[PDB]
Amino acid sequence: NQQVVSITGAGSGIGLELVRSFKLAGYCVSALVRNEEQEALLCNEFKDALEIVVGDVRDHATNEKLIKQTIDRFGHLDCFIANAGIWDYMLNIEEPWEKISSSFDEIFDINVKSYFSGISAALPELKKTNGSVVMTASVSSHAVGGGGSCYIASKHAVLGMVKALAYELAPEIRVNAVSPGGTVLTPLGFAAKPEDVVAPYLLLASRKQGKFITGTVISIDGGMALGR
Amino acid sequence: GNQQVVSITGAGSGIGLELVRSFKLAGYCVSALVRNEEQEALLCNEFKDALEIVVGDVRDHATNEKLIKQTIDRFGHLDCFIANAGIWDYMLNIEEPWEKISSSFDEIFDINVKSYFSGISAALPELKKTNGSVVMTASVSSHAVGGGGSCYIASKHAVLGMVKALAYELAPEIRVNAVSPGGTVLTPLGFAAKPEDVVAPYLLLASRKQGKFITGTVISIDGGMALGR
Amino acid sequence: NQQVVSITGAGSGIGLELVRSFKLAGYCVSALVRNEEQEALLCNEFKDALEIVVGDVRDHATNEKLIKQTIDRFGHLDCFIANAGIWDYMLNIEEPWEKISSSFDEIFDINVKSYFSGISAALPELKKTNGSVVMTASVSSHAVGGGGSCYIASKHAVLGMVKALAYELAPEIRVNAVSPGGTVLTPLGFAAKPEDVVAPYLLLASRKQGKFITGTVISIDGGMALGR
Amino acid sequence: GNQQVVSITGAGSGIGLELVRSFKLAGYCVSALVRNEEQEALLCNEFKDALEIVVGDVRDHATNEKLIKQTIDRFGHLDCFIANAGIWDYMLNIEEPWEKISSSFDEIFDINVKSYFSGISAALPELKKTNGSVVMTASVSSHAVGGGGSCYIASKHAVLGMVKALAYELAPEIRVNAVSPGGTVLTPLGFAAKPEDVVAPYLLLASRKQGKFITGTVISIDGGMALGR
Numbered sequence A, C: 001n002q003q004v005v006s007i008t009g010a011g012s013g014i015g016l017e018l019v020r021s022f023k024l025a026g027y028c029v030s031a032l033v034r035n036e037e038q039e040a041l042l043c044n045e046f047k048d049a050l051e052i053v054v055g056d057v058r059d060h061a062t063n064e065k066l067i068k069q070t071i072d073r074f075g076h077l078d079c080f081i082a083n084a085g086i087w088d089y090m091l092n093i094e095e096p097w098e099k100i101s102s103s104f105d106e107i108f109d110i111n112v113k114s115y116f117s118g119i120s121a122a123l124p125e126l127k128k129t130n131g132s133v134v135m136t137a138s139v140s141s142h143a144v145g146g147g148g149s150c151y152i153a154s155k156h157a158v159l160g161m162v163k164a165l166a167y168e169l170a171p172e173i174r175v176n177a178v179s180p181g182g183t184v185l186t187p188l189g190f191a192a193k194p195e196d197v198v199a200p201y202l203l204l205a206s207r208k209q210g211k212f213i214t215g216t217v218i219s220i221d222g223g224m225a226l227g228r
Numbered sequence B, D: 001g002n003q004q005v006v007s008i009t010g011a012g013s014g015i016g017l018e019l020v021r022s023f024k025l026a027g028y029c030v031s032a033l034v035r036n037e038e039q040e041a042l043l044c045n046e047f048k049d050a051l052e053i054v055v056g057d058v059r060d061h062a063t064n065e066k067l068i069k070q071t072i073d074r075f076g077h078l079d080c081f082i083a084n085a086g087i088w089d090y091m092l093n094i095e096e097p098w099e100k101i102s103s104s105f106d107e108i109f110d111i112n113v114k115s116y117f118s119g120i121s122a123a124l125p126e127l128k129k130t131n132g133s134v135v136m137t138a139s140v141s142s143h144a145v146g147g148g149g150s151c152y153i154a155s156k157h158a159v160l161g162m163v164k165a166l167a168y169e170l171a172p173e174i175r176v177n178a179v180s181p182g183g184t185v186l187t188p189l190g191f192a193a194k195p196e197d198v199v200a201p202y203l204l205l206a207s208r209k210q211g212k213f214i215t216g217t218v219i220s221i222d223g224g225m226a227l228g229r
Helices: A013-026 A036-048 A058-072 A097-129 A148-167 A200-205 B014-028 B035-045 B061-075 B098-131 B148-169 B200-206 C012-023 C038-044 C060-074 C097-129 C149-169 C197-203 D014-027 D037-047 D060-073 D098-130 D150-170 D199-206
Strands: A004-007 A026-032 A051-054 A080-081 A132-136 A174-180 A217-220 B003-007 B027-036 B052-056 B078-081 B133-137 B173-179 B218-221 C004-007 C028-033 C052-055 C079-082 C130-135 C173-181 C217-220 D007-008 D030-034 D050-054 D082-083 D134-136 D175-181 D218-221
Touching: A004 A013, A004 A058, A013 A026, A013 A036, A026 A058, A026 D050, A036 A051, A051 A058, A051 C149, A051 D175, A058 A097, A058 A217, A058 D030, A080 A097, A080 A200, A097 A148, A097 D098, A097 D150, A132 A148, A132 A200, A148 A174, A148 D098, A174 A200, A200 B200, A217 C004, B003 B061, B014 B027, B014 B035, B014 B200, B027 B035, B027 B061, B035 B052, B052 B061, B061 B098, B078 B098, B078 B200, B078 C097, B078 D030, B098 B133, B098 B148, B098 C097, B098 C149, B133 B148, B148 B173, B148 C097, B148 C149, B173 B200, B200 B218, C004 C012, C004 C060, C012 C028, C012 C038, C012 C197, C028 C038, C038 C052, C038 C130, C052 C060, C052 D098, C060 C097, C079 C097, C079 C197, C079 D150, C097 C130, C097 C149, C130 C149, C130 C197, C149 D030, C173 C197, C197 C217, C197 D199, D007 D014, D007 D060, D014 D030, D014 D037, D014 D199, D030 D037, D030 D060, D037 D050, D050 D060, D060 D098, D082 D098, D082 D199, D134 D150, D134 D199, D175 D199, D199 D218
Parallel strands: A004 A026, A004 A080, A026 A051, A080 A132, A132 A174, A174 A217, B003 B027, B003 B078, B027 B052, B078 B133, B133 B173, B173 B218, C004 C028, C004 C079, C028 C052, C079 C130, C130 C173, C173 C217, D007 D030, D007 D082, D030 D050, D082 D134, D134 D175, D175 D218
Antiparallel strands: none
């Protein structure tokens, strides 16, 4: 019953808090970080207990490497958490197409194609454990206001991933998402720290508590998806 | 303050009974509204007198007030109200004679919708003192068709409406959320879940730690049923 | 191919504009109005060309009477448009339960149970023409801001009606809805007059143009369902 | 001013060709972007030289600029831009070798999403002068599963995202909406629709009279397919 999770976007923000939270909950954890300074940050805390890969989620071999080192260290993979993401800083549709086009390629490369890449790399091992995927979506998957059109459209595509993959991969593999927002002015009156938004990830990964949850997006946004 | 207190309608059967067992196991003081004396005896055989139990009909406002009043007197405050008592419509067709439709509609909306309003009205002053939360039981019928007739599906969509309107209205003080279970006691995940399997979202949504940033949210737990067959 | 429509809530607002619009488009029209002054208002314009019933949608016999007089005058019924509705004037959940309870009963009696009543009364004739239903929903069926909790919940229930009835009654009868809002400050910068929101009703009723539309809600709200 | 002008991508086949025929019949001046010369000849055999036609690939930004530029030179202004060119993924499975997934993904998102951005970028300055509208072709795959693989469904969900973000961003000047067709050439309505059957929502959404109050909206026209089987 020893469970193993692999987390992209793990070197900062919600991803770093997920590493802490799944470690605290008993999981073995591997982590994909952008750079060596983030790797040292995890090493100062967990010493050698993690498998850490330093690389770019946009490279598929980096994703294959993360799974390969996970299985080689811990033997199997139970949950893959696709989380690395990037903002568009409210890029307006009026801008020069040269800027729109390059920003689109990066936003969609990281926020959407990387998830396909990470899940393709993780799938053969998730089938042997009948494991699960948890993707990071956004308030921008549901409402306008928190990004430009490129970002909001990339976060909607992730919602389509959840429903399509959950359906294709059931009954064997559960696929879900978490839609955080307003973190680090909401109806709840505060911005949350990344530590406050981790619990939905743990429920959706849990083999006991989430055994019957697939196709589901859990919003955790202070009510931003509602009104302002 | 540490000690948390939760009050649960529809608590003598199905999901509601498992919410009692689950919240008691997590350390809550639990009060519970139950339909009859047999269900009361079920809860006493297991928990003796640790619970506060009211027997009666959730469609009666005074009963909801009684549930709250006993909760406060027995436990002092109220942190979470779970409105969960529900009724089905057994796939009532719209072709049926209006006399039957009219009766079922009154029973479905009184129980699945109006009595959610009544429970929340009765719980509000105490939830404001603790800045607590509400969790409503919605349904897979809140999102997709197939699992009921049109009365049931319309009532479960109305619950989605309450979740959004009340969460907006009561913020920042009170959080309001819902759980949409489905296919309980054939899904894409290949099995029907026991009520014991679907309680974790309620615990998350009531927890002041894990759920402090969640309002207006609806957590589906349906084995993929909303996705389709 | 002569088409016949029956409209509730026809004496004012969108309902009155639907009477004008379907008449202008060639339909025979019957209309349910609240009172005799509204009936005179329609008579001043259309003289005796309509079947007008004066009554309360909450009474089922009034709904049966509207269909009965429609068939007796025009022979058949092609489209039923459930439109009568009522607001809650932002009734807060904090109010005395006595006020909440009575307001709920009226809001749900008119906005939801009346639609079931009108459709039950209209169904046997819609089956013979394989006709259609068009319900009036609201921006409040999708977003908060335009009503109290009772109203917003009643308008969500109508969305559930559309999906349930469309599914139960297909292939024979199409069931759809229109969600108007901000009529008589939106992102489009103006409030619309009821005349501006009628075209979706005509498309969903049209036997040629809407032959393939069922289960559908058409928002016409100046973008209110978006942001503010 | 009376005379309206519409520009349509994906115009040589399927729904796009029927949009040409439908808008021409409603009285518009029509320009059209088409994939090859055979489809150009199809449009000329029917309309002679009344149309402005550009042959080329919607994934190339300069082609979109060319479409607009010819529209203005031939007709003076532009009232509506319909981004409609699409491609399927033939139920590509996520188990397939990544080389294949990576290729399909690039082709699907370039055509179904990126080139919508490109067309709208090219049309914007002219739509602002007329305070015109945009209509995008979404899909039943924007709402439900079943009608594609995960790439296709994700791209069609991204279009829903564009509709909401652009309508919010461009208001009050420019309206932005979408049509979600499905099951074209088994549905709850019992038949598959010809492309000729699904054009009315586009006409409504482009009309400055009938659609002046519609933005951020998506009109499903799918025979009930989103409801389920």
